[PDB]
Ligand binder design. Structure first.
Ligand SMILES: *[C@@H]1O[C@H](CO[C@@H]2O[C@@H](C)[C@@H](O)[C@@H](O)[C@@H]2O)[C@@H](O[C@@H]2O[C@H](CO)[C@@H](O)[C@H](O)[C@H]2NC(C)=O)[C@H](O)[C@H]1NC(C)=O
Ligand SMILES: *[C@@H]1O[C@H](CO[C@@H]2O[C@@H](C)[C@@H](O)[C@@H](O)[C@@H]2O)[C@@H](O[C@@H]2O[C@H](CO)[C@@H](O)[C@H](O)[C@H]2NC(C)=O)[C@H](O)[C@H]1NC(C)=O
Ligand SMILES: *[C@@H]1O[C@H](CO)[C@@H](O[C@@H]2O[C@H](CO)[C@@H](O)[C@H](O)[C@H]2NC(C)=O)[C@H](O)[C@H]1NC(C)=O
Ligand SMILES: *[C@@H]1O[C@H](CO)[C@@H](O[C@@H]2O[C@H](CO)[C@@H](O)[C@H](O)[C@H]2NC(C)=O)[C@H](O)[C@H]1NC(C)=O
Ligand SMILES: *[C@@H]1O[C@H](CO)[C@@H](O)[C@H](O)[C@H]1NC(C)=O
Ligand SMILES: *[C@@H]1O[C@H](CO)[C@@H](O)[C@H](O)[C@H]1NC(C)=O
Ligand SMILES: *[C@@H]1O[C@H](CO)[C@@H](O)[C@H](O)[C@H]1NC(C)=O
Ligand SMILES: *[C@@H]1O[C@H](CO)[C@@H](O)[C@H](O)[C@H]1NC(C)=O
Ligand SMILES: *[C@@H]1O[C@H](CO)[C@@H](O)[C@H](O)[C@H]1NC(C)=O
Ligand SMILES: *[C@@H]1O[C@H](CO)[C@@H](O)[C@H](O)[C@H]1NC(C)=O
Lengths: 610, 76, 612
């Protein structure tokens, strides 16, 4: 076919013919605001680009059809990208987020390959045939690193260099070309970062860079152009195009740029998710973020135990791998203002309250299968799931009640509504047929307990309370936890209400969320913008988990569900044959109960009108 | 060789503890940064091309890291 | 005033005006010869704009109609990045990141003075508040900050220490606050006039640069979005774009009468100050003087410096005083200067003489730069000069014809007094008090230092060994001492005028001495390669001292002491030139003979010179 040159400038991507250099035409694209990094896929006849304003990574055919965003979450400054034409994978480097990530060309199965010891990765260049990838870093002390295309064997290829850009690979001649923005020159070396040579140092302001056949192409910020030169000599120079300012990325589009073979190219390595190239031109199977590679070295299994912390416009998942795996933003669309969150370990579904819409919603990890469970005046404050009976307890800030609703939106009814009292924080403990909640009464706040049917009420604590805003509990530890906003402290006691102690009153500003994961107590501080944890074993003391997390709203721990043990709950299957409420005391006693507007009937299963 | 403020073209035209950094629309010899001194950290790649008040890099054994928002030259 | 408030901004080759309206007309001020405009201010009462040009290295002004284009400061500038107008005292303030100085002068440029010179590390933006007597500026060093001081340079202190490169420093006078951009954190901040109550007005900005405010809005520029935008000055919201597609907008400002209000004692009769009226927070105002001038006991008038030191470079002649305060040296505004090789000074008429090595002439001018006059022109190639202030003569040496030539101060020749086949006179110093002259004679492969009578007779060799490059001479008539510097031998030596008691003064840590001068009891000298001015105590009581470092292309240095008019007239040649036609020599007994150049002969009058 033919070989044209691609370049990005502001809100459009264009192509200049290399035979007829004056043929400057645009690529039929829409919606682009600030095109930065640029790549392609000759096979699929597709173009790829990142948008640092729109915070996306998009793709489309050269004819402009099938424009689609492939990555639209957790991006800050995606100034590095590269298409893996063999493994059919998409690589990118974010400077704002300090991560080198990977996924499929269509965006699924995203995973972080590099995140530890990363300072401003800018340019990225792949080599699937050899199983290596290279990138420049600007932060701290500029350098060019290398690593297997799975993130392994990371090493500093070039230690002494200025901020480098336009990292390009001469696949045929096996060399690395780049521009040094600080030293102001074009350099070159071998794959080992040796045999280093300066191609040109008398250029006014080189920025972009690429190479094709015997030539190198660069852009000049000051001469406002795209020029060309003998790739080894640096001479025999001509001007391809002039009057081109603010050119971000430049790249030659031709078949001879994406050649070679890979095991990932044959059958994706028989991998269930990601096929990632490694040294020798071999490969390895990779998984999505937080997923684990099974013993068969080819299949992936999702995380079973993890933490969920929410902020105003995002819900995040974090895990505790020794690998130190970084937290991620769940791809859930239309998040306006989340107040609280919970999770269903049985069907792996995420639930949350949205104060903007005054409703309760739910969706899966991957953000699909969305569904609203409660809509409306109604004004949800906090929620807590009974994973056994299969319904959601939640408190309303407007009507001041505790409403119960099936996971399918089907209403059950009200279980607690008394004048003067105001339910706020709530956690259910179905294992013992109880529920704990804070009661922010007009003049006296207290922490209460009751049966899941709203009966058998009793005040656990009434002193040392001005604004109990968060609750948590752990059966194993036999503890009840709460945090007070006004008193700036976290307290604990036994589920019984005995042995009350202050866990921490120092260095606390605004606690809004508590949860128990493993044997630690995690809490979020909305004002300090932190997530901290204390060891309930008293061996590790107090440490910080994350810093600078804006608009923290809630934090929730998820433990793997023991199905063999879950099924043993009498109120689990068919809801114990109960019409509405099914609960089980600690003395084994199980029984059907009813919401306030109904009554238990003669069959002691069904509920009817009084 | 070039002293501080002297017109230069390449860092080689400057003295030992200086580099050739652009000031407005030409380049002059500027001093390398020392420990504690504020250094440049670009957000967007393009902001590098636009900079007309260029600082020099951090000196030997110094790294441009964030304070614990400015960035200062600190030791590894 | 009634005229609407409009927006002015500098933009490299031109300065333009726009309205507060979005997408409204954008017109360039009809100016000429503007290369790179940076700092920008105005004077609404005079309908004038001031701007700095960092390519021309000047500060200029003109009316809004482009007329009256004049340069107000055109010397001693490197990078005038900061500049502000004191509309009350009618003064011009500016800061220079290259020279590290905050200076002030009258709006027309005269009576320039340095206000801050110590502990300055790249002063950038400058904002004045003549009503309160305070000035504020941003500083862009290793540790950027925003400082404050009295508008006389007194009471300097840091107002906000935890900031990056701040720019567009502007004051909201009505509501007592400071606004600025930050080029390192890309945000617009604000604080009260004390640097406290520090809030962030806008943070989601890609590349903010310029800034200004008017009424309830702030206006800024953005290099990335190529724009001029505005927003709520307290909120930071209600944001709109005023202008788009504007490349490289350097400085911006609001041209309205309400911006320049208030009053002080300086606005009225200039505080009765002879030269400068400088507002201060405590005491209303203080009177100031030009650089190196003293404020007289009356607290109102000034007196020029009496004694000082002159050191020349290749392209400039500087003056520096010897103060306990360590007052900054200044560049003399001589337009005639191009390539100086040697300097001298006539204390009688108070005028500065130098040799231009390229145009090959000896020129003259007062420190003011005015009253310039060429006294020697052409082949002729002047090497060094030494003024006989009594007979009003210049003794100089020619590198071309290898002679010692003597010329009257007005231009007409007296004649040659020394010429020889193998003679090559270079450095020269006259001692008309005793009747002799001293010079270096760079004969081929045997350099030497000689003496002779001011007519060329009684020649003798003082020194012929221990010499390689006798490059500079200096003498002290009072103590009958001679000093010379040798470039090759890297040392400064001394002796009696007779040539006895030859002693090495300094021979360590010297590379290239090229100038000598005696100032009181000290011997000042300049090192071309070390780029330093140093001094030793001739009495040896105190130790070798550095005066100034990092001075490029040093050529000559010269001490000027106040002339004792009475002691001056005691000299027998002071008036009527001793009744002689040409040279007036001084006998050992204070009596005077008459002599002549090489081409004339003394007549029977024993006063006149005729031809054989
Ligand atoms: C835009 O192009 C796509 C894909 O590229 C086309 O086919 C390539 C092999 C190559 O020849 C390119 O020049 C072409 O542009 C087109 O996708 C095709 O769509 C048709 C149905 O419309 C389908 O039958 C084909 O299988 C598709 N091709 C492939 C390779 O899958 C698409 O039609 C073009 N869009 C428009 C609006 O014309
Ligand atoms: C350009 O303007 C100057 C000065 O501005 C004038 O006075 C200002 C206070 C203000 O009122 C402006 O609108 C005026 O234009 C003009 O200089 C003046 O000229 C007049 C008439 O010749 C004379 O009486 C004044 O003394 C001058 N100076 C001042 C300070 O008023 C000048 O004429 C204008 N040039 C052109 C070409 O129009
Ligand atoms: C508890 O939740 C249920 C729904 O989950 C609410 O029931 C709704 O009541 C309104 C009347 O106010 C009806 O119009 C809706 O059709 C009902 N929804 C469903 C799904 O039945 C109920 O209002 C909530 N709280 C209270 C106080 O009952
Ligand atoms: C010495 O100085 C005088 C000037 O001070 C020079 O005299 C000039 O001589 C030329 C002839 O060569 C005349 O045409 C000029 O008119 C003279 N100038 C003046 C102002 O008188 C003289 O050339 C210098 N050198 C010598 C060797 O005499
Ligand atoms: C490129 O440069 C090399 C070395 O100077 C030279 O041998 C070769 O001919 C050049 N190639 C072209 C296509 O000009
Ligand atoms: C490129 O330039 C070199 C040096 O001027 C010259 O020798 C060579 O022949 C040129 N090559 C081409 C292909 O023009
Ligand atoms: C999985 O990888 C490990 C590590 O190389 C290897 O020891 C093991 O044999 C592999 N398992 C299978 C089923 O191939
Ligand atoms: C700016 O904000 C303040 C309060 O933040 C508000 O009172 C004012 O109306 C806003 N805008 C204007 C035009 O004053
Ligand atoms: C500015 O925006 C606020 C809301 O963001 C609005 O209430 C106000 O009316 C706007 N303008 C003024 C002049 O206050
Ligand atoms: C000059 O200033 C001093 C100190 O303020 C003062 O004592 C003296 O009266 C002043 N001289 C005048 C005003 O003539």
């Amino acid at each position: 076919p033919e070989a044209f040159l691609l370049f990005s400038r502001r809100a459009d991507i264009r192509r200049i013919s290399l035979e007829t250099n004056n043929n400057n035409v645009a690529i039929p694209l829409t919606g682009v605001k600030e095109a930065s990094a640029l790549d392609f896929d000759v096979t699929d006849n597709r173009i790829y680009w990142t948008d640092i304003s729109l915070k996306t990574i998009s793709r489309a055919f050269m004819n402009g059809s099938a424009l689609e965003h492939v990555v639209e979450f957790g991006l800050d400054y995606p100034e590095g990208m590269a298409v893996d034409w063999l493994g059919k994978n998409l690589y990118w480097a974010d400077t704002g987020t300090n991560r080198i990530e990977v996924s499929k060309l269509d965006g699924q199965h995203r995973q972080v390959l590099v995140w530890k010891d990363l300072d401003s990765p800018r340019a990225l260049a792949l080599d699937p045939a050899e199983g290596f990838m290279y990138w420049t870093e600007w932060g701290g002390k500029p350098k060019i690193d290398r690593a297997a295309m799975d993130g392994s064997e990371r090493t500093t290829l070039v230690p002494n260099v200025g901020r480098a850009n336009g990292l390009t690979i001469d696949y045929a001649k096996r060399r690395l070309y780049w521009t040094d923005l600080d030293t102001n020159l074009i350099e070159s070396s071998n794959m080992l970062g040796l045999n280093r040579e300066v191609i040109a140092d008398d250029l006014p302001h080189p920025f972009g860079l690429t190479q094709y056949q015997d030539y190198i192409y660069w852009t000049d910020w000051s001469r406002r152009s795209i020029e060309r030169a003998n790739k080894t000599s640096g001479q025999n120079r001509t001007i391809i195009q002039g009057h081109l300012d603010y050119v971000m990325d430049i790249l030659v589009f031709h078949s001879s740029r994406q050649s070679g073979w890979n095991e990932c190219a044959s059958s994706n390595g028989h991998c269930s998710h990601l096929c990632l190239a490694v040294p020798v031109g071999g490969f390895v199977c990779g998984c999505p973020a937080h997923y684990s590679l099974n013993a068969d070295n080819r299949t992936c299994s999702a995380p079973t135990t993890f933490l969920l912390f929410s902020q105003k416009s995002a819900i995040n998942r974090m895990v505790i791998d020794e690998q130190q795996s970084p937290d991620i933003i769940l791809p859930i669309h239309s998040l306006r203002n989340v107040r609280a969150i919970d999770y269903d370990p049985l069907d792996k579904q995420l639930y949350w309250i949205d104060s903007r819409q005054n409703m309760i919603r739910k969706a899966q990890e991957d953000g699909s299968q969305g569904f609203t469970v409660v809509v409306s005046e109604i004004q949800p404050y906090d929620l807590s799931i009974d994973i056994y009976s299969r319904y959601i307890y939640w408190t309303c800030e407007a009507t001041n009640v505790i409403n119960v609703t099936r996971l399918d939106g089907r209403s059950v009814g009200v279980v607690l509504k008394g004048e003067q009292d105001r339910p706020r924080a709530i956690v259910v403990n179905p294992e013992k047929g109880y529920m704990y909640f804070t009661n922010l009464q007009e003049r006296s706040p207290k922490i209460e307990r009751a049966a899941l049917d709203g009966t058998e009420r009793e005040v656990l604590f009434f002193s040392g309370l001005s604004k109990p805003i968060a609750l948590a509990l752990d059966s194993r530890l036999g503890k009840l936890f709460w945090a007070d906003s006004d008193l700036r402290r976290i307290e604990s006691s036994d589920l019984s209400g005995a042995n009350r102690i202050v866990l921490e009153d120092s260095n606390i500003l605004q606690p809004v969320g508590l949860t128990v994961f493993e044997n630690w107590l995690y809490w979020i501080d909305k004002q300090q913008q932190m997530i901290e944890k204390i060891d309930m074993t008293g061996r590790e003391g107090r440490t910080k988990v994350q810093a600078r997390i804006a608009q923290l709203s809630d934090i929730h721990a998820v433990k793997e569900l023991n199905l063999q043990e879950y099924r043993q709950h009498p109120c689990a299957q068919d809801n114990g044959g109960c019409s509405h409420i099914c609960l089980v005391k600690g003395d084994g006693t199980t029984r059907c109960s009813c919401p306030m507007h109904l009554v238990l009937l003669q069959d002691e299963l069904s509920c009817g009108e009084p | 060789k070039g002293q501080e403020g002297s017109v230069c073209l390449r860092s080689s035209d400057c003295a030992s503890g200086l580099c050739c950094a652009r000031h407005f629309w030409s380049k002059i010899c500027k001093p390398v940064l020392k420990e504690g001194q504020v250094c440049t950290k670009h957000r967007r790649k393009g902001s590098h091309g636009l900079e007309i008040f260029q600082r020099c890099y951090c000196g030997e054994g110094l790294s441009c890291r964030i304070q614990k928002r400015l960035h200062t030259c600190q030791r590894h």
